[PDB]
């Protein structure tokens, strides 16, 4: 590929160390410096046939010298916690350093003006799975297009994520978002959260060596006098759909990057707009 | 409050007809108590809901109009008749200056479309009245020409049942699959799964008994190379019920366009579904 060589901060996070798996794969070449988080220590990780340096945060400085100046061309990606975002993105910006930013959580606002304040090429999207993306633009075209369409129906949404999210999906919200808009009843409080392993594999089918990384959800549309049914799933297994999203958001960034783009500041959808590479 | 025009709808002793009168009737439309019946079809008195409807025979269909037009100026009419009937009905209409919504199928569609153009017909013509299956379909015709390649490399499978001896995939179907392959999914039409079994039909489909002669029940699965990401979509119908509801919103929408007088004479249930709610 002529795409630039990436750096996964951090390659030992769940999202991270999938990423960069994905990434060698893919045949990007993954820089062997990584940061991890405050509280762990310094080490060796095998991605692939990679051998990465896994170095301190209070190291950041340090390491990141060392990578600018052995891959110029560097593009960072960012999987850590919400505790870092805002933090990483202000380093990431103040140094010209362009990222991906996969990371949910932190100031969602101050993290779009950073980025697009100082000009810094980025990706800033809270979902990286794609074709997860795609679904949700799909409903809120339809909702764009079609205002109360479903007006008088009947919405029940439910979903499955490990017991490590109290919360209803961002996905999920804005997903329901649309569905006001075409005209169904619906608050937040009624999202239906599966939390139980036994019934998460039992009824909503998620695999045992998955319950710990997961996201599965239903809306069903249901027709006033109960004839019209509409079911709409995506369910995600582990995190090869995060890794995959990312690398072609890296793979259009680095584009953007090459052509020196008026536009700086892009999103998932941008990336869909332009087709797999 | 609906304010909207009085319906009078050809057949109302046809089962779509019927539904879709009955439809208007418990809506709050005003459905004017004549209605035309096909050639070999005597004249009756039917009741839908608590109004009694004078049947005429077609033959009488002049007479019938100016009946219809003295006491209902602002009439909308409503054809689920049959595909012989079509371009006919449709010629009569454009002639006396009818407004109409057309739901019935066949006939020459160019002819039809030709005639409500040509004569500045305020009128729905669309073979699809299901407004919700319509909403999806385009939706995810939108979603497939903005999201190029976006499922590249995933398995489609397709499953969809019907009353027996439906030997093709469905219009609905066929439009989605089109979608789907904009998204790069590579699939043929005979790859569709063509349930027609009824103990398949209800076991596996979840269709209900009362409903094995009469339904359109679709499943699209969509899933990774890996087999970790799995998309199901489905939308399934039961009888008429959503052809009359959606027949009752396009003579809602009609009735707005004629009112205001728009430049804008024949309309599709797209235009519908993008005029919002009326209800
Ligand atoms: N965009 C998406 O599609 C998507 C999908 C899944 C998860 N996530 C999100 O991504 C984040 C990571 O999820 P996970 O399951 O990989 O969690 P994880 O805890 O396994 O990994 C996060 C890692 O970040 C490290 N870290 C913390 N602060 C850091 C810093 N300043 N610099 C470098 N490293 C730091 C931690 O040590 C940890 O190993 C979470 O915010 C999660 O909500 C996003
Ligand atoms: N748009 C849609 O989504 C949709 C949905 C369901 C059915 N349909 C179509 O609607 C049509 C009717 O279906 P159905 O089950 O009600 O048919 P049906 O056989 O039950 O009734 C049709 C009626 O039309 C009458 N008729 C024939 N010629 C006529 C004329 N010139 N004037 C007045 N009446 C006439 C017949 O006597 C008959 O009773 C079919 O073509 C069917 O494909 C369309
Ligand atoms: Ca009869």
């Given at each position: 590929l002529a795409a630039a060589p990436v750096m996964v901060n951090d390659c030992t996070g769940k999202v991270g160390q999938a990423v960069a798996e994905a990434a060698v794969a893919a045949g990007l070449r993954l820089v062997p410096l990584?940061?991890?988080?405050?509280?762990?220590?310094?080490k060796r990780v095998?991605?692939?046939?990679?051998?990465?340096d896994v170095r301190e945060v209070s190291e950041r400085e340090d390491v990141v010298k060392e990578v600018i100046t052995e891959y110029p061309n560097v593009i960072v990606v960012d999987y850590t916690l919400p505790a870092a975002v805002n933090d990483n993105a202000e380093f990431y910006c103040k140094q010209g350093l362009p990222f991906v930013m996969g990371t949910?959580?932190?100031?969602?606002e101050k993290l779009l003006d950073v980025a697009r304040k100082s000009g810094t090429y980025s990706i800033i999207a809270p979902?990286?799975?794609k074709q997860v993306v795609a679904f949700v633009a799909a409903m809120e075209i339809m909702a764009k297009q079609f205002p109360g369409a479903f007006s008088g129906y009947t919405l029940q949404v439910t979903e499955s994520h490990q017991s490590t999210k109290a919360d209803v999906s961002g996905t999920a919200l804005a997903v329901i978002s649309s569905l006001r808009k075409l005209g169904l009843d619906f608050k937040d409080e009624q999202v239906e959260?599966?939390?139980?392993?036994?019934?998460?594999?039992?009824?909503?089918g998620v695999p045992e060596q998955h319950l710990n990384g997961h996201a599965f959800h239903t809306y069903k549309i249901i027709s006033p006098d109960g004839?019209?049914?509409f079911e709409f799933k995506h369910n995600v297994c582990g995190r090869?759909?995060?890794?995959?999203?990312?690398?072609?958001?890296?793979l259009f960034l680095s584009k953007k990057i090459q052509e020196k783009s008026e536009?700086?500041?892009?999103?998932?959808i941008d990336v869909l707009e332009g087709g797999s590479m």
């Open positions: 990584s940061l991890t988080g405050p509280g762990r220590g310094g095998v991605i692939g046939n990679v051998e990465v949910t959580g932190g100031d969602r979902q990286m799975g959260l599966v939390r139980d392993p036994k019934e998460q594999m039992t009824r909503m004839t019209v049914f090869s759909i995060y890794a995959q999203g990312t690398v072609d958001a890296v536009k700086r500041l892009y999103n998932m």
